[PDB]
Design a binder for these strands. Sequence first.
RNA 1: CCAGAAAAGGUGUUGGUUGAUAUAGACAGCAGGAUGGUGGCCAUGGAAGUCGGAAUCCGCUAAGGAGUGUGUAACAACUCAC
Lengths: 196, 153, 205, 190, 52
Amino acid sequence: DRATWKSNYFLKIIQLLDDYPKCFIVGADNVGSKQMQQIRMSLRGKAVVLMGKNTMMRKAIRGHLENNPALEKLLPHIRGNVGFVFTKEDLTEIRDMLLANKVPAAARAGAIAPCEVTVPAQNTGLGPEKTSFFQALGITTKISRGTIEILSDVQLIKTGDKVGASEATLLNMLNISPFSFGLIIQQVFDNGSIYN
Amino acid sequence: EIKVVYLRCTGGEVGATSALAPKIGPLGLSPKKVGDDIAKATGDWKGLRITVKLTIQNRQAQIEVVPSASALIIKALKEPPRDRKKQKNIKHSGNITFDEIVNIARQMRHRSLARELSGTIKEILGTAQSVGCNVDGRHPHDIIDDINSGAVE
Amino acid sequence: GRRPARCYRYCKNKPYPKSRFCRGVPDAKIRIFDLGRKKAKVDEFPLCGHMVSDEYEQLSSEALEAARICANKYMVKSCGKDGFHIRVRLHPFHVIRINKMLQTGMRGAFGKPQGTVARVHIGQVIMSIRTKLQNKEHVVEALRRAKFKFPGRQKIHISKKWGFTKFNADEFEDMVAEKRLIPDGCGVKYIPNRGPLDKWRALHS
Amino acid sequence: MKTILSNQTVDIPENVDISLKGRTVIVKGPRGTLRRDFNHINVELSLLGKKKKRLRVDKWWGNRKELATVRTICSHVQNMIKGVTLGFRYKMRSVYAHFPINVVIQENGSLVEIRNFLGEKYIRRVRMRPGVACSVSQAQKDELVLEGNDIELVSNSAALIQQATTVKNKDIRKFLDGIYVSEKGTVQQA
Amino acid sequence: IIEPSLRQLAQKYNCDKMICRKCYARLHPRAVNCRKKKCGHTNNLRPKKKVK
RNA sequence: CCAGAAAAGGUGUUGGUUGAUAUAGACAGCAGGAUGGUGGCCAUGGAAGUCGGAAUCCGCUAAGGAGUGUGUAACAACUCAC
Ligand SMILES: [Mg+2]
Ligand SMILES: [Mg+2]
Ligand SMILES: [Mg+2]
Ligand SMILES: [Zn+2]
């Protein structure tokens, strides 16, 4: 149950700080479970990435602090959906591989827009029967080669818009999603030191 | 311009219900020479439920079978197939053993959507009670295999 | 054509049963009193909930069967087909009489037998459901749905007794380990220290 | 029970000026002056802090049906402060299937003639209650902006025209016509 | 024939209500029991049958 | 006495019992995930978690049910548990 789940999460955060004295305190903001599972399955032999409740991790640090007096600089940097990644291989190779394991995820109907979605003017490969999903956007189209010809471009959503339902299914039809959310790491903890 | 499509076919028999044409038609290629060649390319599957990817160029598609774990365990659970009659409840009984479960778990790590082999044998022994047979006992008997009496790589 | 139970609802008469004097009584509406897997041991259903009445009233046999089917339908929906035991602990014996007019009037007024009606006291158990200890809420809910088939005020009480026995639920398994109690089906057998001890040694053999 | 004391404070910003004549409140700020008479509600209203920073309402010995009135005074006062510092803007949009709703504003915000609703010839004249102004906005096709200070007058004048444009004796689940309140909000964003 | 966000704007005032089983009062969507003392503030509500 | 009312209800309000979970940070609320074997097996004309009969476990997990609902010819889409 929940009590033994709390109590053995305590032990599996005692041990993973005892054996790894080098960490990135990583902000896992709005990434998918799919993407985090495929990154975690890719990076198993190199590192261990871990998540949890911030008010449980900080009390685990305040259960260590009479034994390991170096861990308390983590405490002001644990807020937001922010976990840990532990590694012993090198210092910036895993920074670079976290920057290289980024995947552009789909645009959910209700997510806010980080950056700049447009569509190129092109003949798609969809077909004639799927033009009502363009007519809801009111994009002027033509049909040629049996598929739909986009005449001119449209910047459909700005930097900082709400992604609507009619505007979300059409990008999933065109298999284009510029929204790339990955690990956006904040600080570094290496043996009582802080790097940006 | 190389394209990838998926089709969920039924194995060895030529499918009279055409579902190939509504995908192969809009790019122009002939679907009825694709669908029967898929059936003879499967051949020994012959009774089961099989998904197949098709890498289709501007010229010709290539046929190769996507594996699916509930089909791969039931093709090893070999009983004589029921014909056109298709009566009551083909509930699967019989005793598959662990070594072919290992070499099917090899196919489950072929495309690497799992953890390693000690986890794949657990998640594919779960598919055994998804199907309905037993390895001389059920997963309440076969959790204590991977607990301290494993036969795993 | 049956009169409303507000007529035949209070314990008005002395108990007048089907006997050598009242002939031609129509048979009772309810005739099945135990339901579910009644072939179950005392060991496998510890929990027991009682619909206990709280007014000195008269319940009809048709109301007994209606509430019986009401509890049975809900528990075969909820606890599964084969996982409880319903017992109706009131058998209808007081028969009720009817003076029908067709113009004689009240001359020679003594009724033909119409039906059978159970007479209930303050604190008598009407229905009792024996099931496993995690199906407690389904006992409460089934008896709460079965309350609405009876007149008056009835309440629900989950007993401290082990199932359909007269022994307390905490010390029951202790006494069956110490062998003062012997399982013999849905009930239990009480073994005193007063027999010939050939029976004692046949138990302790 | 009766709770011995329930109080809440309301922070009063630097540009606005509340003061008290007994139990009624008056608020002076940039957009205007707005008063409200709380003489039905039986509380204590202290104006504490010098530079007049907090309005503390407290009620002594209340049942829960009258302790419920403790922070509803706070809600009315801070809604009043919002309406005097920033003002209120209800943008309510016209929705129609076939016949367009013609909204024409008369006597500079104070009367609204609504025409051609469901094609019918009856003109709907709705008067804004005094102190709010209706206007057909630009950069939106069929919108009515109701600007005012106090939300009771603004939202009540909005609710008058929303109860005016009603479809009667027909299926309201199919006939989705009329003007409806779309975007509640604020004239001057903070 | 109608813009869809305007359509759901009209539906939040005409469609996604609750209706009491007794008295037939029209209630807000996050309702638990009725408003009227006509029906005894009763507890059984239905989600207002939508249009097909 | 005695001159009129019941079953049933109420998030009106007041007391009382019993059991939960909560500074290892709960209940609202606003936001982010809600995934792989797998579209599990019978079954259906089509049943991809979402009509039905039994099953109803693992991986990865901070977490995700062989699924609480809205749906779909059926997926997609949304929502919930967590
Ligand atoms: Mg009558
Ligand atoms: Mg008598
Ligand atoms: Mg009509
Ligand atoms: Zn009502």
